[PDB]
Amino acid sequence: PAMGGFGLKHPPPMMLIKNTPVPGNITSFSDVPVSSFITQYSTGQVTVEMEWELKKENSKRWNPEIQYTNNYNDPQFVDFAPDSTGEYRTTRPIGTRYLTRPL
Amino acid sequence: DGVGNASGDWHCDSTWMGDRVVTKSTRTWVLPSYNNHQYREIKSGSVDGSNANAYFGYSTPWGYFDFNRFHSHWSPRDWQRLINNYWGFRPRSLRVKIFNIQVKEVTVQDSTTTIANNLTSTVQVFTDDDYQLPYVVGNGTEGCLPAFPPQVFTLPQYGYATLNRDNTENPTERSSFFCLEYFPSKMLRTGNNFEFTYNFEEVPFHSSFAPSQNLFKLANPLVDQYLYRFVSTNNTGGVQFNKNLAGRYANTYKNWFPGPMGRTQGWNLGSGVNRASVSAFATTNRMELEGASYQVPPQPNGMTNNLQGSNTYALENTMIFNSQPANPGTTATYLEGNMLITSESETQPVNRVAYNVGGQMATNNQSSTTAPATGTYNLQEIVPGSVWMERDVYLQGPIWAKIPETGAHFHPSPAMGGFGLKHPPPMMLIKNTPVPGNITSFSDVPVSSFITQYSTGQVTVEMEWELKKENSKRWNPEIQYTNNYNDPQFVDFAPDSTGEYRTTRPIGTRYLTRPL
Amino acid sequence: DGVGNASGDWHCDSTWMGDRVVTKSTRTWVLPSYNNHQYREIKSGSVDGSNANAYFGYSTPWGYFDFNRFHSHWSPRDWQRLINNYWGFRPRSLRVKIFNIQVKEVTVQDSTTTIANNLTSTVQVFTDDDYQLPYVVGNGTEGCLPAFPPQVFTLPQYGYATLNRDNTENPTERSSFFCLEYFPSKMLRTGNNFEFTYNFEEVPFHSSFAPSQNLFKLANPLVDQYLYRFVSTNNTGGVQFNKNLAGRYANTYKNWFPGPMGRTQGWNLGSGVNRASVSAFATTNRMELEGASYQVPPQPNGMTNNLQGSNTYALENTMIFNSQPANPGTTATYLEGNMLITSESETQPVNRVAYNVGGQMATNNQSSTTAPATGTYNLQEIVPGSVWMERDVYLQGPIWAKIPETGAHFHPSPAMGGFGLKHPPPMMLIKNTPVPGNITSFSDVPVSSFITQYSTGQVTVEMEWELKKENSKRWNPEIQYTNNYNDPQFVDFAPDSTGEYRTTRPIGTRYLTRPL
Amino acid sequence: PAMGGFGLKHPPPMMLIKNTPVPGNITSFSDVPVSSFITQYSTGQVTVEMEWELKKENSKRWNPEIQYTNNYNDPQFVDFAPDSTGEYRTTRPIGTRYLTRPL
């Protein structure tokens, strides 16, 4: 895929969810479908557990490598943390290539 | 289990079984929803003209159980039974239980504020068993299980300070954020309960006895020493000696020395004039750290803040409690009449007096032309063959402290008293799981409207303590902690006419004596 | 073992055993001490007016064995036996042996330069089996085992380029240094030997046959197609069709297409006028990479550089060898008479001609007012149902290339021919262990005076190849590679009067034919 | 130890080495010790193999940590590598504390 990631023939199936409808007060019969419902919503918890397999880095480079590091000159707030308002901050995209390999 | 079945029972007790005693306490707690479910980054600059006051940290929406006060486990009367009969004690195990939970939803429509219970809501609970979070429990802060069992308490909010940059409110690239929802926790509905056990690591017994002898006068007052001492020079400069006589303790040779001391200022309580209109801060004992100046009460162990039968107190070497609990952030000026000022006068035979100089020593080299000169010192640290007594534990004081992980420490015994532990009883955190209000459309922006609610429940703590049996051969009767009041107007350690619990005195731990 | 016992024997051979053939080669190598035992950081700026020439890297004091040329394993006559009889072949295994080592010390005192052998000196040897080092072997560079067995060769010095910054000589924070002494190696004294085996990964057979049919004329010339084709519009604009007749290949419907092509410039060899006083570079085919322009011979697979029976060559789609080995860094201007110019004319029935346009196609939309227009193209990449022939292997050419590790590639077959391997025969590095000169005092500064020395020894390579038996039903006789010279003045592929090995022609691999 | 490292009661024993003396041409007897030797030196290889035990980092910090990283603005040469002369370069002391822990 152009946007990155794994391309799958059969990816993690979609999980759909909905609130089962509950009819309001209906006093007479009609062949026309019910259109008045009790308004409602739901909430809950969801847990996702993923196992990932890793490929161990096996280099013979002598000198030290580049690493992703928390480097900020005079931070006004901690990055990747909630600020004074409670809203989560993120000031930079973190890619994936820091280690090197000879071609 | 279910809504109409109770998840646990009430246990308050004390079971003495020889070498052990087991205490049980149950209390009723209430938990507010803190911060409205969110983390906030809290901070401060230089407050009250001191940048040691600056910090940077985080408040969380979690609350925690804190039972690190002796009165949370001991009744006044069991405490008396302990300090009048044993030479020491130490904690062995801990068992905690949270049960009978009830989540209440609060709705304030049209100023009616009705409280209904929500049978389907949860509270999350976990214990930080690997000490991965900032441990805030053993630092003399409020929010512990109350002294008196019928009292209902509010759990305090968990928060912590991390690193600030240059004594300002700003963080550093090393400041850390800990998300507590990033630990595994249990969820409890109204029929559920949480249970947790812990064993303390072998620690030394607290020493609940006072020394019956003075450290500098351990020689037999009937025999002379076979050692001599330099006493002067004759008109020509030749040195002269004199034998150390029997009972002349001012001159005998000593084998052991008193513990470390750092002079503190002494003030008079009750009768006894002090300097008028003083402002303590400017002249208190300080330690520098990262460029800032901090007060360091109660000073390090090894001194005595009071000399028996005297009203002079080295106030900063003292633990000062209030006779009652206070409201948050009070700036009232309390007087001696409101306090429970502790005294360590029963360690004076071994610990130096904090408001006096520690001794003196040679300042020059005498010769036919110069006379020997000496100069006193105000501080003196550890030397080899030094002995002192640790600070005492009070019923209204702290049981343990976590020894900071740094890889290097000396004699891990906390300044405020109690046991110093590498791995102390883990923190137990708790919070009301958030429940969203009516949300009708989708948004990628996080939900910010919740149903307001709170919880309440019971908590039981069960601690096993090991005792060290007193084994004296003293002939005459000892001093004992006793209920002695001249013309009581009310019973102490009991509820008064209003229903509020009274306590007029700090109860330490050293009544029994021992020869050195 | 010992000084007076030989550590191995001489093996040169070829053993044909049906479906397999095993070649063995032994050569004598000499190894100079490179750089005087030290690593140097080598670099270049923009040379010859091209910053694609800039680099940054390291030379090391190691040398390596390179046997990635066919003539290192095949004699001219065994090569002929292979290309006249088989349809394909592929490498199966490799076994290498280094033995009979001799370290020589060289002393030049008073211009006498005497060579003595040093019985106690070592050479270090290792193979990079995990491909942790820059693999420089399959890039058409010199220093392979020689074609002719009696020749003695010098091992080349290992060096590599890493990343340079912005087409300049400077490194980047990603440039890496590899210390080769940081791998485990064997040490060999004059009685020792080194042995190493390897198995190739299943690869496709090389195709050593030429197509006996043209790809666009696979239909039976006797039958018409049951498909029709648009041939015009009548005076009103209505469309008209015509049946595709028998043998009218210019119109039949096709199922398959020729391989990818990128137009290259065509030049005439021998007879055939070219533009006078030209400077190729300015107009050669290029690819940009990191901001620089690189020439890319021999262009990607799928084209033919020559049309059989013609003297026009798409020179940059061609492998050009020299009839003999040259000195390092020669800037001489060779003429056609000195070269061994290869031709891929036997793939013309399937591969497009590199110096011609690749075809044409619709450029507009016809209507009552506009006539259909078409435009030719100069490049065309892969389409589905495309077929082409890979480049041929020559006796004087390369056997394999390492496929670069990037996680994404298409049809890993090297432009220069041969097998593309994920994990190719590991590099074998070798160096003379340094021996310090007379050092009389201590210094923390590394020793810089060494005894000068070199080594020599024998190396044996044993490769097993698998063959694909030719299974034709052609009736008439085939084309074969044959020793045909009109009035020879010397025998080709033999030493001349001087003792130097002659080779006047590149010997490819496609003589046998097959119907498509 | 003030300079850092491990303080040992019984540290890795000292390994001493010397060239055994070889007397020059001595033609007569003397009770006086020989003082003329053949001058010589030695050389060889030395291999040291150390096993180290590690303490695995077990943090619950959320935001990213500080890491030692190869960061140079406009390098003129690779650090911790041989330069054009062949001499090994090192422009910075590399300590050991990058990870953090709550007290």
Side-chain angles (χ1 to χ4, degrees), chain B residues 191-493:
Chain B
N192 299 134
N193 68 47
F194 179 75
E195 172 70 61
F196 165 69
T197 65
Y198 166 87
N199 289 95
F200 289 77
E201 58 200 55
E202 186 205 357
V203 268
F205 281 99
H206 173 71
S207 288
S208 28
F209 58 77
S212 220
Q213 299 189 274
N214 173 313
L215 185 76
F216 282 160
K217 64 183 86 176
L218 298 176
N220 174 330
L222 295 176
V223 210
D224 305 313
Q225 273 192 325
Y226 57 71
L227 295 155
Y228 290 56
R229 81 183 181 279
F230 169 64
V231 304
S232 58
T233 54
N234 48 50
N235 69 300
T236 309
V239 308
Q240 310 181 135
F241 310 76
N242 267 26
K243 190 183 192 183
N244 290 330
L245 299 189
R248 298 296 185 68
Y249 295 118
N251 314 297
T252 60
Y253 273 53
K254 311 302 195 310
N255 270 316
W256 316 107
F257 307 89
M261 68 90 49
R263 196 180 183 174
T264 313
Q265 183 74 69
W267 302 90
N268 301 122
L269 300 187
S271 179
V273 33
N274 291 302
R275 176 86 204 197
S277 298
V278 138
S279 185
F281 197 62
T283 42
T284 53
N285 287 17
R286 318 283 255 294
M287 277 193 200
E288 310 293 304
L289 197 57
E290 297 192 308
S293 213
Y294 300 72
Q295 285 180 328
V296 280
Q299 267 17 80
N301 284 166
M303 290 178 283
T304 188
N305 62 305
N306 190 227
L307 217 42
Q308 174 70 224
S310 188
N311 51 52
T312 304
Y313 289 70
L315 284 177
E316 310 163 2
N317 183 52
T318 310
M319 297 275 88
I320 313 180
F321 308 92
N322 200 48
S323 60
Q324 56 196 62
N327 279 299
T330 60
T331 56
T333 303
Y334 299 86
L335 308 168
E336 189 210 325
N338 303 93
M339 321 300 343
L340 298 189
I341 296 176
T342 67
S343 171
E344 301 289 308
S345 68
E346 64 289 313
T347 51
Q348 62 169 269
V350 175
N351 288 4
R352 283 187 266 196
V353 175
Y355 49 88
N356 283 151
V357 301
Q360 54 175 33
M361 52 187 40
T363 56
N364 70 334
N365 282 303
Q366 58 80 38
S367 56
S368 59
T369 310
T370 68
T374 187
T376 51
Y377 53 88
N378 297 318
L379 51 155
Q380 172 168 59
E381 296 74 45
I382 294 284
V383 300
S386 220
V387 316
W388 62 91
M389 284 246 269
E390 316 270 43
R391 182 177 302 273
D392 209 6
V393 298
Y394 293 80
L395 179 61
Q396 28 287 89
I399 313 174
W400 68 74
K402 196 197 192 285
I403 300 166
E405 222 329 66
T406 50
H409 59 265
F410 173 58
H411 210 271
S413 215
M416 291 179 239
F419 309 82
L421 306 161
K422 213 53 186 168
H423 303 118
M427 290 199 71
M428 193 163 307
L429 294 123
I430 192 168
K431 71 154 187 180
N432 298 321
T433 301
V435 174
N438 185 208
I439 296 176
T440 70
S441 62
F442 166 86
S443 195
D444 199 36
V445 170
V447 171
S448 59
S449 69
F450 299 96
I451 297 309
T452 143
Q453 62 186 201
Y454 67 87
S455 36
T456 166
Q458 266 75 61
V459 59
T460 283
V461 198
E462 171 186 38
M463 299 204 46
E464 182 170 71
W465 311 79
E466 189 189 345
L467 305 156
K468 182 158 67 181
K469 213 14 168 181
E470 163 269 328
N471 191 207
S472 200
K473 289 299 274 195
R474 180 188 168 114
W475 176 261
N476 60 316
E478 233 128 347
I479 271 182
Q480 299 264 270
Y481 175 70
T482 190
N483 210 45
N484 68 89
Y485 305 84
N486 173 268
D487 186 302
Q489 286 297 291
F490 60 90
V491 174
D492 195 28
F493 291 98

Side-chain angles (χ1 to χ4, degrees), chain A residues 57-75:
Chain A
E57 163 269 328
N58 191 207
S59 200
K60 289 299 274 195
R61 180 188 168 114
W62 176 261
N63 60 316
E65 233 128 347
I66 271 181
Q67 299 264 270
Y68 175 70
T69 190
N70 210 45
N71 68 89
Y72 305 84
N73 173 268
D74 186 302

Side-chain angles (χ1 to χ4, degrees), chain C residues 39-41 58 165 173 436-437, chain D residues 41 70 74-75 78 83-84 86:
Chain C
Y39 290 74
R40 295 229 195 83
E41 147 198 302
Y58 288 100
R165 176 163 57 67
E173 50 197 359
Chain D
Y41 67 87
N70 210 45
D74 186 302
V78 174
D83 76 328
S84 50

Side-chain angles (χ1 to χ4, degrees), chain C residues 38-41 43 56 58 165 170-173 175 177 187 433 435-439 451, chain D residues 39 41 43 45 70-78 80-88:
Chain C
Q38 56 199 345
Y39 290 74
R40 295 229 195 83
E41 147 198 302
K43 68 193 191 168
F56 177 85
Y58 288 100
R165 176 163 57 67
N170 300 295
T172 72
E173 50 197 359
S175 296
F177 173 60
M187 287 176 108
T433 301
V435 174
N438 185 208
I439 296 176
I451 297 309
Chain D
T39 143
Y41 67 87
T43 166
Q45 266 75 61
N70 210 45
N71 68 89
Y72 305 84
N73 173 268
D74 186 302
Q76 286 297 291
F77 60 90
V78 174
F80 291 98
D83 76 328
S84 50
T85 295
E87 75 174 1
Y88 192 62

Side-chain angles (χ1 to χ4, degrees), chain C residues 265-332:
Chain C
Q265 183 74 69
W267 302 90
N268 301 122
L269 300 187
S271 179
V273 33
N274 291 302
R275 176 86 204 197
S277 298
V278 138
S279 185
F281 197 62
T283 42
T284 53
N285 287 17
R286 318 283 255 294
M287 277 193 200
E288 310 293 304
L289 197 57
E290 297 192 308
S293 213
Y294 300 72
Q295 285 180 328
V296 280
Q299 267 17 80
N301 284 166
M303 290 178 283
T304 188
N305 62 305
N306 190 227
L307 217 42
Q308 174 70 224
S310 188
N311 51 52
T312 304
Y313 289 70
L315 284 177
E316 310 163 2
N317 183 52
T318 310
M319 297 275 88
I320 313 180
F321 308 92
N322 200 48
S323 60
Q324 56 196 62
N327 279 299
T330 60
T331 56

Side-chain angles (χ1 to χ4, degrees), chain D residues 31-53:
Chain D
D31 199 36
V32 170
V34 171
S35 59
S36 69
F37 299 96
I38 297 309
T39 143
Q40 62 186 201
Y41 67 87
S42 36
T43 166
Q45 266 75 61
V46 59
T47 283
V48 198
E49 171 186 38
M50 299 204 46
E51 182 170 71
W52 311 79
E53 189 189 345

